[PDB]
């Protein structure tokens, strides 16, 4: 049998497609959803999980909903004032993606997973966590823990229509069946330099969270 | 005896094709494509019950497959331009191609390599039942090592031929199928147009096969 | 108390907001969804109905899902070849809107409703059924049957964001919880002249369907 | 409030449409199906009755399935040899329609109905019971018992397509959801003269059956 | 332990007795009833089957009720006009017995039976299918398929009383617990020559039905 | 409106038809079956009662199965030796009909019935209880108790076929769904003179049984 | 029976005590909790409501948990960048309080309540949203809608110990059984002028939300 991989899953179109495409290849998927504690109307997600189980059966090996609110708070919210004053951009959703990755190190090590997959896309590159500089940074971070971070729909998705009509071909809804962050439409577009600087500044906190989650320290960075 | 697949609508001809295979001792997997534009499909279940009562375990399954996405990609996405350029509504030809693309994937995943339909000689005005379309689709399936057969094609010189064989099996003569909303929505195309449309759409059909196999995301 | 009105409801953002806005005013709403027979993955609709019932209670007086496939076929599909060749645009979704309105005449007359509401929007004016020429044609058509056809979010909705964040303020999801037409992204943009010509051409069929649905004739349009 | 009428109902397209059209007008309909005893695969009928009840509710006031095998035998089968030798045509299905009408006199009188309706059509006039001469004959027969016999789709239905598309507009299947007579495709086309002569010859039997069903005689014609 | 044989069973007296007599000998019996689609009031049959199961237990190895309406129609009804004009006799019940025999070839071959038995009787020889010429024709037809067709009460039954009082001695009702054909009392008596000519004319249709039922052809004669 | 009448009912064709014909006229019928204690295989009767209830509903007002074995014994069996030696005919079934009539006087008087009906027929006049002389005798006997004894199918039934095909027209089986007397086919045909002499000889016993059943005496005739 | 009042209720000690003290007087209370959508570990709240129902029975006339996430987003999150750059302080929780008040106008008007009560105390001095300048502003806002805003434990509660010992005398836990906001006041003091400027800037949004919730407009603030 083929080793299960993890998919960072929102119920949105792109992460649904990434999971489906792996399953089409015979790769079992563990769906993993991060609840940051600032996400609204997540109930529709269960409709999407049912669609995926109906289409792929046992290749959906599980769905973990993880509470990442504390890590998210430590990285992105506790120093929000200072962060916004320094970078002049609201980067909390970049912080969220880093909090996700910290939690994923711990999850992967405790559940014998070493490939993680997301649904970032080329056409969404205005979003900081989907920029090449962020993806490269997070690939490097995961590689330090021997975790392979892949983005299987990144290059294919030149528009939302590309993702939608592949889903439709699988007999799955084209709608985005996800919760929304309260931070939706709460930010302007940051430069690549700012994205990378924020990631570098917060990285010590992220690694520290990894170490705490592993039971290796209580002390701060 | 290795099970074979029948493309099954509940209609008279596909019912008879399945029955005739079962009479020979061949188990049949009934496969129905739901294109997403079919009305009043509920009566199908009466036909499946008739067939199970008459043939028992030789009916090895009934899959109802959602093929709406492939149908849309092949036949509906470019409907405006397709009708303007060929001057014929060929969506039901596109549907049959979408069916065949799905059947490649289904056959490969379920260890089937003979598929069967109920196209008939007397229905040759319909594009997917013309010899040029049948030949094209046989060739397409053969490229995937699938044998596509049409066991009532030559026998059925009229609807009456099919009906009275069904009656001899103790099965109703009625057509217990849903209808396409595209019923009576087209004029008759030439063979050249049918074949041109099939050749134009074939790369998309093969691409759908490849996506369904998990081999690519990219367009043709 | 206040007389119930009907909302043409998909589960989408705009028709959700139109229904909610009426209910906020104390107007009970009968939700009406047309199943044209060519719509995919409608199951999510029920999530939206539940959200609306949780937020508004008994002001949601009902949800009718009507099979309009035969009227849709007669208006928009049966002569698809000819229609596309003549107008050089695929107008089936305009035909669908007309089929909806024909069914709504019959529904309103049989259920004591005389105001119908939709969620068409200004920002979606590229779509033929949402253009002012279509809206005003259909307003006039409904008025000839003593039905008031209104579009309560039409002028407010200068973008999808306007509709979304009003829904969010009601504690309702911002997502479009609707099925999709198979005819999604199957057409190019028609002129206003074409939209109006198509509506005028098909109107006699629509009226004939109204008459049949009322039990008044079997005969086809003259 | 409006007096119920009867519809001679097979589950076929035309009688379905006749019943539906009456109901659209606010007329409640009692569906009546004659089982001649020679009808095959009648099971599908119940799908159609369900469709009609779903579309029209309480306007469908009932469905009677009547055993008319004995009347059918007496009129059309018992003297089959002589009938075919004399007329050189198999007219059993004309006899069946007469047997239906005899039963309907009794049914109407016992159930307070005085309008009956069928789904004969113009485009099916090759069939003996649908010819104008047969319709006229049976109208006259019913009128002698103060019963109004109407054919509400007769003139409209210039083809099967006319009936089908009206059904589809009602959200009802276009298929013919009826049993078939074993006598399907068992006859050649009779002349009008033969149709009328057969009806006149069998009429005394039909009236006698009416009288027996009313409890008025045991004796033969 | 003894090989099961088939009995052509109506619930009538003679086929009941034939089945019982075989079972008294230790021969298990598969009861087979052909429903032509034109037979009335068949419900009473189940009373007889219960009587037989109570008297003989496991020697009744089953009861198949076969729908033979399509074969019956093809052989006897479809060309009724021509058949009656040519022979000047209604021979549908002879056609029915041929349709039964066609179905029995297929049933015997698929269920490992090679002896079939009926309850034709000497005293019923006015009926075409019970004449010696019909019996010998059908014996020959069955023999071509390696099926032995026997009539175990044929010679014993010089009157109905002979059959009745043997049944009574078994603790079984003397009544004929069978349906009737609508074609009851619908025919005059044919000559032996006509019976044989009809059987010879219809035989190709019967054999073709055998071939279709075996899955060997679709084509007509 | 209409007063219920009684029908002497066996489940046989003629008594079934008599009851049905009364019900067709709007006369409710109380079915009454006499069990003499020497009748076999009576279970099939219940199929017939069900047919009648299905066809006529509430017009079947009841079915009494009466144990008349003691009256039958006293009239017809106790002096069987003497009776047969004197008349040279086994007349037990005539005795049975007299026992029935004695019981019917008591039943009618206790249940407010004053018209009784049977299914004796012209074509069965070889049977002693169906001869004109027996019918006349029993009419006179019943008239002495103010009971009207009628035979509504007596004159109509010139053959079994007359009865059968009227039943078929009602949607009822043509079979005789009755038990049989063990005394079936146990007698030769008596003269009218013998029938009448036997009836006159046994009448005092029958009247005495009437008186005992009324509670008016214990003493013998 | 006496007219029910509302208590702005967190499950914390002070708003618990305020509600209890009103109920001791025979005043029925509707407990109302605003869920911003960014509050964590709110499950313990139900333990507190149960304690209160056990102690006071039918004087607890309900507990509404209102989803105010959309109003909160519109007021305090959507323009976070601009808000922080202009005022140089994170005032999200002040924005939250304004969103609460907007929702309270709508709730009070639809449930026939005209007195609301909170658990403000003397010892609650740290937070900008607890300053007298904010309270005065919000009292004035409620008064414009004829709603009386009262603070029944304000003068008694010179420290948290004062509140705790009264709760204990009622047989209720002294713990703060509430969720926490993911947000938290940063070290700087803003000036009163800044607090009031923020409130005045956001007030038009808040009133517009009130008007939308009443079914009176769809249009944005003006
Ligand atoms: N950084 C970041 N922001 C996102 C992302 N997705 C959404 N957002 C923000 O949230 C807003 C609303 O997102 P959605 O609810 O998905 O908006 P939408 O695309 O109109 O809606 P759907 O079609 O239902 O997905 C966007 O306009 C962004 O401000 C993401 O992947 N990254
Ligand atoms: N291309 C194509 N069109 C078909 C096919 N079958 C039906 N149609 C179309 O659909 C119409 C109606 O189909 P059916 O409902 O099967 O028609 P029918 O068998 O003539 O009659 P009904 O069963 O009573 O409706 C036809 O007239 C065609 O326009 C088919 O196999 N291929
Ligand atoms: N005429 C018409 N076409 C529409 C309408 N809505 C959608 N379409 C068509 O369908 C396509 C996809 O619509 P949606 O699936 O609603 O768009 P989306 O933003 O991907 O998804 P949603 O979140 O469901 O709104 C559009 O690009 C149009 O081609 C409408 O109101 N009228
Ligand atoms: N006299 C008479 N014969 C009929 C009538 N309807 C059908 N038949 C006969 O029965 C045959 C078959 O009837 P159907 O099975 O309904 O024929 P069909 O409409 O071609 O069959 P489908 O399309 O499968 O529904 C006809 O060809 C006629 O011989 C009728 O109303 N009157
Ligand atoms: N060809 C043929 N006709 C039969 C046969 N059995 C019965 N019939 C016909 O059906 C008619 C009546 O059948 P039954 O009701 O069984 O005859 P019956 O002897 O009056 O009735 P029961 O004693 O009640 O069984 C006969 O008069 C014949 O016309 C048979 O074996 N062959
Ligand atoms: N006296 C008298 N004897 C009868 C009567 N009916 C039947 N029997 C006797 O009982 C015998 C058998 O009756 P049934 O079993 O009804 O005989 P059947 O009517 O010839 O034929 P089946 O109904 O097929 O048995 C007759 O032959 C008579 O001896 C009757 O009404 N009166
Ligand atoms: N000796 C001792 N006293 C304690 C301890 N924890 C709390 N207390 C005291 O007990 C009293 C009430 O305890 P708590 O309710 O825990 O104190 P608190 O400040 O309310 O704490 P929280 O309710 O957790 O915010 C106070 O007067 C505290 O001084 C402990 O571990 N040891
Ligand atoms: N809370 C979360 N938990 C898990 N994965 C997440 C979360 N938030 C974001 N991601 C990952 O980030 C990717 C990018 O998000 P994005 O919104 O662009 O895609 P999506 O939600 O899959 O699709 P859609 O375009 O419909 O929103 C997601 O595909 C997912 O893999
Ligand atoms: N949706 C579908 N799914 C599967 N097979 C299909 C589908 N549509 C058509 N086919 C195939 O195409 C053949 C031709 O269709 P056609 O309508 O002529 O036949 P039918 O439905 O079997 O019979 P009928 O004459 O009653 O309609 C069918 O017999 C069937 O094998
Ligand atoms: N099948 C249908 N049944 C009923 N009303 C419909 C149907 N299709 C469209 N409508 C009406 O027309 C409008 C179509 O416009 P549009 O699709 O933009 O709106 P929506 O579905 O409410 O929102 P969204 O932008 O989320 O799709 C709907 O708001 C609704 O009022
Ligand atoms: N057994 C029956 N019971 C009642 N009415 C009958 C019966 N047989 C025929 N009819 C009447 O005769 C009419 C003509 O029959 P015909 O078969 O043409 O119509 P249909 O069955 O309604 O439609 P279809 O064309 O689908 O068969 C029927 O509509 C019905 O009213
Ligand atoms: N439909 C049928 N299915 C099976 N066997 C049949 C059928 N019709 C006739 N037969 C056979 O042919 C014979 C017909 O003769 P007949 O009807 O006289 O006999 P029966 O029904 O057994 O007795 P009865 O004299 O009581 O009717 C039956 O005994 C039976 O073996
Ligand atoms: N045991 C009985 N109980 C009641 N009535 C009886 C009884 N025996 C005979 N009769 C009456 O006398 C008649 C006897 O005549 P016969 O037996 O011929 O009639 P049947 O049983 O009705 O019909 P069949 O001819 O089928 O036997 C019956 O019709 C019935 O009215
Ligand atoms: N989300 C909210 N919903 C309703 N009222 C609230 C909310 N947040 C704050 N308040 C009001 O403002 C006060 C906030 O101050 P504080 O947190 O000291 O009070 P508390 O929650 O009652 O007590 P504590 O938090 O110390 O247990 C509450 O007493 C309450 O009246
Ligand atoms: Mg997303
Ligand atoms: Mg078909
Ligand atoms: Mg929409
Ligand atoms: Mg019909
Ligand atoms: Mg028999
Ligand atoms: Mg009898
Ligand atoms: Mg607090």
TrEMBL record, chains C, G:
InterPro entries linked: Rossmann-like_a/b/a_fold
Taxonomic superkingdom: Bacteria
Protein name: Asparagine synthetase domain-containing protein
């Amino acid at each position: 049998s083929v080793k299960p991989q993890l998919v960072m899953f929102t119920g949105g179109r792109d992460s649904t497609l990434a999971a489906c495409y792996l399953m089409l290849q015979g790769i079992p998927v563990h769906l993993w959803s991060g609840n940051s504690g600032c996400s609204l109307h997540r109930g529709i997600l269960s409709h999407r999980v049912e669609e995926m189980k109906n289409r792929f059966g046992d290749l959906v090996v599980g769905h973990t909903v993880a509470d990442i609110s504390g890590a998210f708070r430590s990285i992105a919210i506790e120093a929000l004032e200072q962060d916004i004053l320094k970078y002049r951009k609201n980067l909390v959703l970049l912080g969220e993606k880093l909090a996700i990755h910290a939690h994923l190190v711990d999850f992967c090590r405790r559940n014998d997973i070493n490939t993680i997959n997301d649904g970032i896309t080329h056409y969404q590159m205005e979003f900081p966590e989907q920029r090449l500089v962020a993806k490269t940074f997070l690939m490097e971070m995961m590689a330090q823990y021997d975790i392979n971070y892949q983005s299987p729909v990144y290059e294919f998705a030149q528009s939302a229509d590309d993702v939608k009509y592949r889903l439709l071909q699988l007999g799955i809804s084209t709608k985005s069946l996800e919760g929304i962050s309260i931070f939706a439409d709460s930010f302007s577009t940051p430069s690549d330099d700012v994205v990378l600087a924020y990631l570098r500044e917060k990285a010590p906190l992220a690694h520290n969270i990894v170490n705490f989650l592993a039971g290796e320290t209580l002390n701060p960075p």
